[PDB]
Swiss-Prot record:
<feature type="binding site">
    <location>
        <position position="181"/>
    </location>
    <ligand>
        <name>Mn(2+)</name>
    </ligand>
</feature>
<dbReference type="Pfam" id="PF07883">
    <property type="entry name" value="Cupin_2"/>
</dbReference>
<keyword id="KW-0659">Purine metabolism</keyword>
<dbReference type="GO" id="GO:0005737">
    <property type="term" value="C:cytoplasm"/>
</dbReference>
<comment type="function">
    <text>Involved in the anaerobic nitrogen utilization via the assimilation of allantoin. Catalyzes the second stereospecific hydrolysis reaction (deamination) of the allantoin degradation pathway, producing S-ureidoglycolate and ammonia from S-ureidoglycine.</text>
</comment>
<feature type="binding site">
    <location>
        <position position="234"/>
    </location>
    <ligand>
        <name>substrate</name>
    </ligand>
</feature>
<dbReference type="GO" id="GO:0006144">
    <property type="term" value="P:purine nucleobase metabolic process"/>
</dbReference>
<dbReference type="InterPro" id="IPR044704">
    <property type="entry name" value="UGlyAH_cupin_N"/>
</dbReference>
<dbReference type="GO" id="GO:0071522">
    <property type="term" value="F:ureidoglycine aminohydrolase activity"/>
</dbReference>
<feature type="binding site">
    <location>
        <position position="183"/>
    </location>
    <ligand>
        <name>Mn(2+)</name>
    </ligand>
</feature>
<keyword id="KW-0479">Metal-binding</keyword>
<dbReference type="InterPro" id="IPR017627">
    <property type="entry name" value="UGHY"/>
</dbReference>
<dbReference type="InterPro" id="IPR011051">
    <property type="entry name" value="RmlC_Cupin_sf"/>
</dbReference>
<dbReference type="GO" id="GO:0030145">
    <property type="term" value="F:manganese ion binding"/>
</dbReference>
<comment type="similarity">
    <text>Belongs to the UGHY family.</text>
</comment>
<keyword id="KW-0963">Cytoplasm</keyword>
<dbReference type="InterPro" id="IPR014710">
    <property type="entry name" value="RmlC-like_jellyroll"/>
</dbReference>
Length: 242
């Protein structure tokens, strides 16, 4: 049989713990402000996340010219593929694959497909948490130009001004290393490329390009290549308010 039919139907959920979503096999979301593009909402508080993230494929002139952000809301955009034109804080950014844009609270973001063919984007937003004597700021660039800490990438500054960060993990084929972790902090991962196997709630699940995974608070993760790379969020630098 076709390797594909085998991997058909993997969308599993364990609210608050984890969820494997396959945005493909999902109904599109009609979100005001988004024109000529298919938007599909992923993690949301109703799933337990303290953020909302999206996967959006932009058709010709697809994007959001209305302004994505919101008051007290910070956002982050990542060009999965194609070319778009983002705008924020009066500036303009020509983002190509790997191009990213972070906006501090308040600085609405707009973006549109900059090419003829479809451009695919990954969106993320959360309610920013201010701390005395600090503040975040607009950050933009391309993954290519990022440090190369297997390879870990840190998209945002580590300063307390920031209360979150986006990362990309890559695993070359002949790799002998794998991913693992336990955490109080949630995670939202979108598999950028390759194919691998994850171990969420003690069960192995083949994972692949296009898949999305919600790792809830207080969960154990693990995965390995089989180039396997994925982008993922992570809140940080903050105490827990009660």
């Amino acid at each position: 049989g076709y390797r594909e039919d085998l991997l058909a139907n993997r969308a599993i959920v364990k609210h608050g713990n984890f969820a494997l979503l396959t945005p493909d096999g999902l109904v599109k979301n009609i979100i005001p402000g988004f024109e000529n593009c298919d938007a599909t909402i992923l993690s949301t508080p109703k799933l337990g996340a303290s953020f909302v993230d999206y996967l959006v494929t932009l058709h010709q002139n697809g994007g959001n010219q209305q302004g994505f952000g919101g008051e007290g809301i910070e956002t982050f955009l990542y060009v999965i593929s194609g070319n778009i034109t983002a705008k924020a804080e009066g500036k303009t950014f020509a983002l190509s694959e790997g191009g990213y844009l972070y906006c501090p609270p308040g600085s609405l973001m707009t973006f549109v497909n900059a090419q003829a063919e479809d451009s695919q984007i990954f969106l993320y937003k959360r309610r920013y948490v201010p701390v005395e004597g600090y503040a975040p700021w607009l950050v933009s660039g391309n993954a290519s130009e990022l440090e190369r800490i297997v390879i870990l990438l840190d998209f945002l500054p580590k300063e307390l001004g920031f209360d979150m960060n986006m990362h990309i993990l890559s695993f070359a084929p002949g790799a002998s290393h794998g991913y693992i972790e336990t955490h109080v902090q949630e995670h939202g991962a979108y598999i950028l490329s390759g194919q691998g196997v994850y171990n969420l709630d003690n069960n192995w699940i083949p994972v692949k390009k296009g898949d999305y995974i919600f790792m809830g608070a207080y969960s154990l993760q693990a995965g390995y290549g089989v180039a396997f790379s994925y982008i993922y969020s992570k809140d940080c630098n903050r105490d827990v308010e009660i």
